[PDB]
Amino acid sequence: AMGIELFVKAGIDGESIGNCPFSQRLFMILWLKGVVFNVTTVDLGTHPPFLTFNGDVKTDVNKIEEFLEETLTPEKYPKLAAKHRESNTAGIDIFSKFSAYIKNTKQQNNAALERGLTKALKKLDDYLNTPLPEEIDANTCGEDKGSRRKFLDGDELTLADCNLLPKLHVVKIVAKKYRNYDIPAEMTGLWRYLKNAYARDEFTNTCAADSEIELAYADVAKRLSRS
C-alpha cells in the first residue's frame, strides 16, 4: 500500500484532465480509498490509463480495479465493492446505446436510436428509485414509497459508481452538445444521482471540463447528414 503513480489522459492543454471515463474511474477509486498517490496527465492516445504500485506497472482497468480492492483493505483502507449485484449491472448498456446514437448519420434511424438510449437511461432510473431491501427494512424510504439513496448501492460511493458516473456524465454532455438531447427531468432518480455525484469532490475534481468532453467527440459524433 505505497508508491502509487497514476497515469491519466491529458487534456488539450497538456496539463488538465482529458476526456477518459476509465482514467476518472481509477482516479475516483484511488481517492475513495484514502491512499497516498500521485497522478500525472500524459498523451496516452488510444492507450488505457494505468498505474504503478511500488514501481511495478499495473495494466487493464478492470484488473487494476481488482488489484486495488484486494491490496488496499481494512482496517486502513475502506472496502469499496458494491454489496448488491444489481448495482454492478445497472446502466451497463447506456454508453453503447449513446455511442450508436451520436454516430448514426441517417435521420431515418435517429428516433429508434434515441428511444434505445432513453430506455437504457430509464432502467437505470428505475433501479435508483426502487428501494433497496435495507431501506424497506429501515423505513428510510421516501414518502412516495421510493428510494432516496444517494448512489447505486447505498449512500456511499462504490466501485460500481466509479465505473458508471464518468460514462453517464459523458453521455449527458455529449448527447446534449451533438443531438440537443436532454436526459428527461422526470427521471428523478437518475438526476438525484448525477447531482449527488456533482456534489462530491471525488467526482468533480477528477472530471474533465465540459469543453474538453465536447471537443473530444467532435470527430466521433456525426451530424444527421444522410436521410
Q: How far apart are CA 178 and CA 218, in angstroms?
A: 8
Residue type, 47: H
Sign of the dihedral through C-alpha 130, 77, 36, 71? negative
**C-beta of residue 25 within 8 angstroms of C-beta of residue 61:** yes
Q: How far apart are CA 91 and CA 98, in angstroms?
A: 11
Q: Tell me, yes or no, if the two domains 4-71 and 85-216 fold the same way.
A: no
Residues 6+ away with beta carbon under 8 Å from 206? 17, 24, 27, 28, 31
DSSP state of 207: P
Which is it for strands 4-9 and 50-53: parallel, antiparallel or unpaired? antiparallel
Spatial CA neighbour of 175 closest among 124, 126, 103, 111? 103
Q: Which three cell numbers stand for residue 130?
A: 426502487
**C-beta of residue 61 within 8 angstroms of C-beta of residue 22:** yes
Ranges of each domain in the chain: 4-71, 85-216
Residues 6+ away with beta carbon under 8 Å from 157? 28, 32, 80, 151, 200, 202
**C-beta of residue 95 within 8 angstroms of C-beta of residue 167:** yes
Burial 95-127 (b: 16+ CB within 10 A, else e): bebbbebbebeeeeeeeebbebbbebbbbbbeb
Spacing of C-alpha 128 from chain mean position: 15
Q: In the CATH scheme, what is the homologous superfamily, with its name and number, of domain 4-71? A: Glutaredoxin (3.40.30.10)
| DSSP 3-state of 164 | helix
> Alpha-carbon dihedral of residues 210, 215, 216, 220, nearest 10 degrees?
120
Q: How far apart are CA 112 and CA 3, in angstroms?
A: 49
Entry resolution (Å): 2.1
Q: For the chain, what's the residue count? A: 227
Angle CA(159)–CA(49)–CA(17) in degrees, nearest 5? 90
What are residue 209's phi and psi, to 5 degrees? -65, 155
Q: Which experimental approach was used here?
A: X-ray
Q: How far apart are CA 124 and CA 184, in angstroms?
A: 13
* CB neighbours of residue 185 within 10 Å: 8
Pick the CATH number of 85-216 from 3.30.750.24, 2.70.150.10, 1.10.10.10, 1.20.1050.10: 1.20.1050.10
Complete edge-to-edge strand list for the sheet that includes strand 38-42: 38-42, 4-9, 50-53, 56-58
